[PDB]
Amino acid sequence: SDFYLPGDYLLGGLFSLHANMKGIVHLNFLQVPMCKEYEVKVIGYNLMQAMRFAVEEINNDSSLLPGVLLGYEIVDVCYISNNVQPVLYFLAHEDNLLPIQEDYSNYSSRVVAVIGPDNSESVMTVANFLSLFLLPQITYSAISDELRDKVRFPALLRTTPSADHHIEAMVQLMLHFRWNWIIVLVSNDTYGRDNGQLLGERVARRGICIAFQETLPTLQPNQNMTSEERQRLVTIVDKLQQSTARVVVVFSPDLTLYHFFNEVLRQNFTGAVWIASESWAIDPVLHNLTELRHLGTFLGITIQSVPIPGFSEFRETCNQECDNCLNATLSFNTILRLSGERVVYSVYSAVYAVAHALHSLLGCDKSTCTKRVVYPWQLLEEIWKVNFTLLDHQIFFDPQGDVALHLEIVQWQWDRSQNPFQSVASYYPLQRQLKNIQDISWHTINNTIPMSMCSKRCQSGQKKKPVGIHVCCFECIDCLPGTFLNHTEDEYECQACPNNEWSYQSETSCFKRQ
Amino acid sequence: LCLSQQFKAQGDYILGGLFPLGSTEEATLNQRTQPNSIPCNRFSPLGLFLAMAMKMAVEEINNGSALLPGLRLGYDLFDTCSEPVVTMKSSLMFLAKVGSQSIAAYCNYTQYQPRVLAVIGPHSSELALITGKFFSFFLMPQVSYSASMDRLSDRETFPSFFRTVPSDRVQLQAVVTLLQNFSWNWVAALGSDDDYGREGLSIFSSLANARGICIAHEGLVPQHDTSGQQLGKVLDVLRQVNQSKVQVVVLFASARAVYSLFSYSIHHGLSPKVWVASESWLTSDLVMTLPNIARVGTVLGFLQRGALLPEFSHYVETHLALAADPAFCASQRCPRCDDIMLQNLSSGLLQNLQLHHQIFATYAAVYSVAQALHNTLQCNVSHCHVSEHVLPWQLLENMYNMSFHARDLTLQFDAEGNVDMEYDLKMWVWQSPTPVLHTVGTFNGTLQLQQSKMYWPGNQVPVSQCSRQCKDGQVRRVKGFHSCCYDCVDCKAGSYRKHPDDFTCTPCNQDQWSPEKSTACLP
Ligand SMILES: COC(=O)[C@H](Cc1ccccc1)NC(=O)[C@H](CC(=O)O)NCCCc1ccc(OC)c(O)c1
């Protein structure tokens, strides 16, 4: 089966193959939650296939672990449900019993490293257990900043930039095109609240103002909604309609947006720039909503493309099975093949990092390895030190556990036989800089950049007067005769001319007068 | 002493207990490289007193016929050491099988048998969150004597978590009712720099918009006196508050933060206001002992009313004496409990005895578990259905709808595992040679104020409210951290208000003129 591969050393793998935002977290009739009820996820199965392909590559590559067989033990978390039993199963002995001991330094667990969950809550929940044993956990797609605390999470590493870099990319994109006036929509969960708060904090210091921040209800695509929730969505869309801010930043899962955009479609709303967070920036399903292209311009923050040769062809004990995954993948096969391999590269690099760390730990030569009983804390100690090039990129972990991969801003395209998600800008995190902003096809008539500001810039010699809370919002007032306004000295109040000078009804300087 | 040996006792059903019964040196703050045993050599009396409260409750239950007649209740306690790793070790031991040191990864737990019936949870919200997910996966009923974070109320993520201290939301609801009562509609809100420091402000700001209170200003204040830049932030905060024309301030911060803020306010004088405190900052010794506190103004706050346990201190003295008796040997989880001396701590700290009602909360948690088991066994005054051994998930079904008689009180767990509780409202008369506190009122789901007993700086009630409605002739302009209220502007003569909710006023034409507040122009 696809979830199991015996070998000398086993990797644990946690992927969200099935997910529902509302679900049974606890034991269900005193049995582990059944995962296959919660629909099916294309991207999660894709990442599982990425890990499988990585291990097959390593087993084929005789130069990386000669004579040592690498295996995997894959279990599908279900978002926040089914978090505990996978960890207990990974840590337990061959008879599924886990002994409690004062010192674990000699304890040989079933798996040597865990390729951790895709989401933050599960990542932290698993790290709480794994820090007890110091079993390394490499996480591919959790952006939360709290994971950089190595007092709380001594065994946790990442192959992806942090949330701070994503928000920095958003802010710098907004500044480049001079969008001073924006809207933020967040989901009713930790992800939306945390990311929206972070965006607010970083925005406050940069000269950008938020019209409002609004919370979406946690609906589900195949669930018929109540009238109350329908009116809630209508209220949100109407508030969008009457606002002058035409830039909308969305921090939400993909599941909760299907109903939202449908509503926006039937409300005849159009002409906004939608900035997607990585949670839905590259989702195939939302992209397949063909008429969604009438709502405006769709941009998203995501990982850079790193093409993996051979993965496209490759893609052609409870909770260790999926039935609908293959059928779902086969339908989106073409879109996936035309899309760049963005997070798949995080999974690939995580597996290769474990491979290199184990290769060093066994003292292995180009030719042969001396097989030894590995205790996971030594492998974590080695993982901290790896430094290698995998596909034209240096993979190493900074002192706070992150690999500094490039982020990209992408535009959605609905042409076919070329890329669904075109790269329009590249963000370098070690430089903290957004660069190489390429052509964007805007919804405007002559392809002019769409604007959003609270109010227009004043004429010369004309002073500002604030309105409301926002610094960005001002009205312009003339500097009456005898007063002048050098805008580099002040912008909200006019200077007064010397006794021997005077000024006209509005000017930047005075003139001599008796 | 021989006291570490006494944190475990036999019984037919055994309660687990997580307590702050120890601490670790600062050298432990580094990143661990090898999974060695974490040292917790540093004593903690608070944990000792809490554990003694649990022991006293269980002894009372084991003597009386009113609960669990004819069967013995047991316990074994562990130190959390305020450390997630040690806490996790303790909880994993709790869920291990009866008679074994190991925990099973089964798929079905339909006949699993862990060694404890219920766990009396940790003292801090971080460890409560960490342990609650694990415990509530197994549906292990957990009762916390101190974990007040609102996030723990969620039955979806924490189906089996209970607590005997109210959530912060109830305290903030009491504050909001107090604000409504005097129509203190226009307020500024402050909190500490830490997580709690703005969790409180988030809850308060959410509550205010649902009831009208206008949060004019928000901010965080530090608890680090030496940080000059953060003192710049506090100076900015105070200048902003003074500029906002607010007269009432809500202050959710820690005691040291308030001490710093108030000391600075003393030195540069500020202006008097009404300051509304929190269970964290209340009866604050350092704040009350300020040199010239009168410059602050009025100080108010709600405080929980925990019941008396008059016999507790004598019980603690008795058992420490018994732990000193060398014959009692015939009768570690805490390394220093066997070293610590008898007299000065047990006397002075229980004379100083926040601690009292948390002790009572631990007692009530033990009684809640005991009454839940009594109901589950369907015990008569002289019978129980002992033909079976009650598994933990069977208590959970019976724990939601119970009521338990803690000493003189009667208590329940609501639909979110939170107890019904009442508060006193206490106000500072600062004008006596030393400040004095008076019970101005009470909160029992609704607010009762003894208006006749309050004092005010001008012998009249302070006010802050802002208008929301305006006259048809008045322009409306938004203010507030949210868009909650408008300061009306009377339009000057020579201009007119075209319609009653416009946000600007329009000049009249040259052939016409208008008086103030006019909607029209005249020739
Ligand atoms: C609470 O956060 C969230 O609900 C969302 C949505 C989500 C829910 C369940 C499982 C996965 C994602 N989280 C994220 O997007 C996290 C960041 C974080 O979680 O901090 N980055 C994942 C980017 C690549 C991705 C992988 C797997 C996908 O489906 C299985 C998927 O759609 C997208």
**DSSP string for A38-56:** S---HHHHHHHHHHHHHHH
d(Cα B370, Cα B74) in Å, to the nearest integer?
11
In sequence order, what are the residues at sequence separation of 6 or more whose Cβ sits closer than 8 angstroms to the Cβ of residue B428?
B288, B298, B299, B300, B435, B436, B437
Query: Is A490 inside any structural domain?
Result: yes
Q: Given CB atoms, is B129 within the 8 Å cutoff of chain A?
A: no
Q: Give residue ranges of A with CB < 8 Å to any B CB.
A: 22, 25-27, 30-32, 80, 83-85, 88-89, 92, 96-105, 125, 128-129, 131-134, 150-152, 154, 317-318, 377, 381, 467-469
The torsion of the CA quartet B131, B135, B141, B145, rounded to 10 degrees, works out to 0
The torsion of the CA quartet A388, A389, A390, A393, rounded to 10 degrees, works out to 130
Block residue for tokens 């644990």: A12
Q: Is A312:A338 a contact under the CB 8 Å cutoff?
A: no
In sequence order, what are the residues at sequence separation of 6 or more whose Cβ sits closer than 8 angstroms to the Cβ of residue A160?
A139, A140, A141, A142, A143, A303, A343, A346, A402, A403, A405
**Shortest CB distance from A27 goes to which of B103, B130, B138?**
B138
Closest chain B residue to the Cα of A129, Cα to Cα: B88
Continuous segment of H or E residues that includes residue B87: helix B84-94
Regarding whether A417 and A278 lie in a shared domain, the answer is yes
- In B277-353, the DSSP E strands lie at 297-304
Answer whether A118 contacts ligand 1 (Cβ < 6 A): yes
Three-state secondary-structure class, residue B305: coil
Give the distance (Å) from ligand 1 centre to CA of residue B385: 49
B4-26+38-166+307-412, superfamily in CATH? Response regulator (3.40.50.2300)
The sign of the dihedral angle between the CA atoms of A444, A447, A451, A457 is negative
**Same fold yes or no, B4-26+38-166+307-412 and B468-523:** no
Closest chain B residue to the Cα of A82, Cα to Cα: B137
* Cα–Cα distance list, B314 to B47, B56, B321, B337, B344 (Å): 17, 11, 10, 18, 14
Give the distance (Å) from ligand 1 centre to CA of residue A147: 15
Query: Which one, of B282, B318, B216, B286, lies nearest residue B428 by Cα?
Result: B282
Regarding whether A268 and A328 lie in a shared domain, the answer is no
d(Cα B108, Cα B417) in Å, to the nearest integer?
27
Query: Is A246 inside any structural domain?
Result: yes
Contact state of B157 with A100 under an 8 Å Cβ cutoff: no
**Shortest CB distance from B110 goes to which of A30, A84, A150?**
A30
Q: Given CB atoms, is B243 within the 8 Å cutoff of chain A?
A: no
Q: Given CB atoms, is B156 within the 8 Å cutoff of chain A?
A: yes
**DSSP string for B441-492:** EEESSSEEE-GGG---TTSS-------S---TTEE--EESSSS-EE--EEPP
Regarding whether A467 and A425 lie in a shared domain, the answer is no
- Which fold, B468-523? Tumor Necrosis Factor Receptor, subunit A; domain 2 (2.10.50)
Continuous segment of H or E residues that includes residue B324: helix B312-324
Query: Is A156 inside any structural domain?
Result: yes
Give the distance (Å) from ligand 1 centre to CA of residue B345: 52
Query: Is A406 inside any structural domain?
Result: no
Contact state of B137 with A25 under an 8 Å Cβ cutoff: yes
Structure token digits, residue A439 = 């052509």
A77 has which bridge partners?
Answer: A16
Q: Give φ, ψ of A166 to 5 degrees.
A: -60, -45
Q: Is A301:A280 a contact under the CB 8 Å cutoff?
A: no
Number of domains in chain A: 3
- In A173-265, the DSSP E strands lie at 181-187, 209-216, 247-251
CATH number of the domain to which A359 belongs: 3.40.50.2300
Give the distance (Å) from ligand 1 centre to CA of residue A39: 15
Q: Position A91: which residue type? A: L
Number of residues that make up chain B: 523
Structure token digits, residue B402 = 């119970």
Mutate to test the pocket of ligand 1, among A279, A303, A339, A347 (most ligand atoms within 8 A of CB): A279
Q: Is A77:A44 a contact under the CB 8 Å cutoff?
A: no
Answer whether A404 contacts ligand 1 (Cβ < 6 A): no
Query: Is A440 inside any structural domain?
Result: no
Q: Angle A261-A262-A266 (CA atoms, 0-180°, nearest 5)? A: 115
Q: Position B97: which residue type? A: K
**DSSP string for A378-440:** HHHHHHTT--EESSSSEE---TTSB--PPEEEEEE---SSS-SEEEEEEEETTTTEEE-----
B168-305+422-453, superfamily in CATH? Response regulator (3.40.50.2300)
d(Cα B324, Cα B320) in Å, to the nearest integer?
6
In sequence order, what are the residues at sequence separation of 6 or more whose Cβ sits closer than 8 angstroms to the Cβ of residue A17?
A35, A40, A41, A44, A45, A48, A76, A322, A325
Question: Measured between beta carbons, which residues in chain B are less than 8 angstroms from residue A468?
Answer: 477-478
Regarding whether A247 and A182 lie in a shared domain, the answer is yes
In sequence order, what are the residues at sequence separation of 6 or more whose Cβ sits closer than 8 angstroms to the Cβ of residue B185?
B179, B212, B213, B214, B464, B465, B466, B485
d(Cα A157, Cα A39) in Å, to the nearest integer?
30
Q: Position B169: which residue type? A: R
Give the distance (Å) from ligand 1 centre to CA of residue A2: 22
Question: Measured between beta carbons, which residues in chain B are less than 8 angstroms from residue A105?
Answer: 34-36
The HSE-up count of residue A107 (CA atoms within 13 Å, CB side) is 24
Closest chain A residue to the Cα of B129, Cα to Cα: A125
* Cα–Cα distance list, B250 to A137, B215, B273 (Å): 43, 10, 10
The torsion of the CA quartet B160, B72, B127, A111, rounded to 10 degrees, works out to -80
Query: Which one, of B424, B425, B397, B394, lies nearest residue B413 by Cα?
Result: B397
Mutate to test the pocket of ligand 1, among A15, A16, A38, A118 (most ligand atoms within 8 A of CB): A118
Strand bridging mode B8-9 / B73-79: antiparallel
Burial label for A299, CB within 10 Å (0-12, 13-18, 19+), is buried
Answer whether A254 contacts ligand 1 (Cβ < 6 A): yes
Per-residue HEC secondary structure of B402-413 comes to CEECCCCCCEEE
d(Cα A397, Cα A418) in Å, to the nearest integer?
34
Question: Measured between beta carbons, which residues in chain B are less than 8 angstroms from residue A30?
Answer: 108-110, 112, 139, 393
Q: Is B440:B453 a contact under the CB 8 Å cutoff?
A: yes
Q: Angle B158-B160-B165 (CA atoms, 0-180°, nearest 5)? A: 85
Contact state of A25 with B36 under an 8 Å Cβ cutoff: no
Regarding whether A417 and A274 lie in a shared domain, the answer is yes
Regarding whether A133 and A25 lie in a shared domain, the answer is yes
d(Cα B82, Cα A292) in Å, to the nearest integer?
51
Regarding whether A122 and A53 lie in a shared domain, the answer is yes
d(Cα B287, Cα B430) in Å, to the nearest integer?
12
Q: Is B186:B464 a contact under the CB 8 Å cutoff?
A: yes
Three-state secondary-structure class, residue B418: strand
CB atoms within 10 A of CB B320: 20
Answer whether A119 contacts ligand 1 (Cβ < 6 A): yes
Give 3-state DSSP helix, strand, coil % of chain B, rounded to 5: 35, 20, 45
Q: Which domain covers residue A112, as residue numbers?
A: 4-160+317-340+343-395
Domain positions in chain B are: 4-26+38-166+307-412, 168-305+422-453, 468-523
Question: Measured between beta carbons, which residues in chain B are less than 8 angstroms from residue A134?
Answer: 32-35
**DSSP string for B114-160:** BS-SEEE--SSHHHHHHHHHHHHHTT--EEESS---GGGG-TTT-TT
Q: Is B495:B505 a contact under the CB 8 Å cutoff?
A: yes
Structure token digits, residue B433 = 């040679």
Query: Is A451 inside any structural domain?
Result: no
Query: Is A264 inside any structural domain?
Result: yes
Regarding whether A427 and A291 lie in a shared domain, the answer is yes
CB atoms within 10 A of CB B415: 9
Helix axes A120-133, A84-91, angle to 10 degrees: 30
Continuous segment of H or E residues that includes residue B215: strand B214-221
Question: Measured between beta carbons, which residues in chain A are less than 8 angstroms from residue B39?
Answer: none
Burial label for A370, CB within 10 Å (0-12, 13-18, 19+), is exposed
Burial A420-438 (b: 16+ CB within 10 A, else e): bbbbbbbbbbeeeebeeee
Regarding whether A150 and A13 lie in a shared domain, the answer is yes
Three-state secondary-structure class, residue B521: coil
Strand bridging mode B102-104 / B297-304: unpaired
Regarding whether A474 and A372 lie in a shared domain, the answer is no
Structure token digits, residue A168 = 């920095």
Structure token digits, residue B174 = 């009491």
**DSSP string for B481-499:** SSS-EE--EEPPTTEE-SS
Answer whether A452 contacts ligand 1 (Cβ < 6 A): no
Query: Which one, of B193, B201, B192, lies nearest residue B150 by Cα?
Result: B201
Regarding whether A213 and A126 lie in a shared domain, the answer is no
Three-state secondary-structure class, residue A84: helix
Q: Position B274: which residue type? A: V
Regarding whether A133 and A204 lie in a shared domain, the answer is no
d(Cα B495, Cα B508) in Å, to the nearest integer?
5
Burial label for B376, CB within 10 Å (0-12, 13-18, 19+), is buried
Min Cα separation B486/chain A (Å): 10
Q: Is B487:B479 a contact under the CB 8 Å cutoff?
A: yes
Number of residues that make up chain A: 514
Q: Given CB atoms, is B38 within the 8 Å cutoff of chain A?
A: no
Block residue for tokens 């002289």: B382
Burial label for B10, CB within 10 Å (0-12, 13-18, 19+), is exposed
